[PDB]
Design a protein around this ligand. Structure first.
Ligand SMILES: OC[C@H](Nc1ncnc2[nH]ccc12)[C@@H]1CCc2ccccc21
Length: 167
């Protein structure tokens, strides 16, 4: 039993809600919140900008030190950093940005990172300003993640579309 509230069960291990991941994190303080990151951990907009702003830019400061030491992530890759005031940990996961010309097959690789964590609060990877088909992202999530994932989808209209079209 966990403290996630009001989620619609989709499969054995995947749950979904129409919510801002930042607000879900502020309320639940999960062990792991997933950021929809880019390879440079430059948290400008979307999920990343919203999470970072909620940390008063501490996420960005920590991320800049990470990159200075380790260099960029891979598309499809991840790193674990602090969750600051939002969660114990933040799993920064890089889904392909098809507006940047990146390979959609890497979306499965991106979701595989979730399997290293028993429970996660996560956004829909590669959706939104990352440009991919959100129905596709949800399908890849369900078919790839085996651990318990609570998906927060900000946009009400797309949430309604995601639920109504889910197979
Ligand atoms: O609603 C669309 C959804 N954005 C969010 N989902 C949940 N909490 C959120 N809080 C702020 C935004 C946001 C998709 C998922 C990945 C991504 C990256 C950039 C923009 C949009 C998106």
């Amino acid at each position: 039993v966990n403290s996630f509230s009001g989620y619609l069960k989709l499969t054995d291990n995947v749950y979904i809600k129409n919510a801002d991941i930042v607000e879900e994190a502020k309320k639940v303080k999960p062990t792991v919140v997933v950021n929809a990151a880019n390879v440079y951990l430059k948290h400008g907009g979307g999920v990343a900008g919203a999470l970072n702003k909620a940390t008063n830019n501490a996420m960005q400061v920590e991320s800049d030190d990470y990159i200075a030491t380790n260099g960029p992530l891979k598309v499809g890759g991840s790193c674990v950093l602090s969750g600051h005031n939002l969660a114990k940990h933040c799993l920064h996961v890089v889904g392909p940005n098809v507006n940047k010309g990146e390979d959609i097959q890497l979306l499965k690789s991106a979701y595989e990172n979730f399997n290293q964590h028993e429970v996660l609060l996560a956004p829909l990877l590669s959706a939104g300003i990352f440009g991919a088909d959100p129905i596709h992202s949800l399908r890849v999530c369900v078919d790839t993640v085996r651990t318990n994932v609570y998906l927060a989808v900000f946009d009400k209209n797309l949430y309604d579309k995601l639920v109504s079209s889910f197979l």
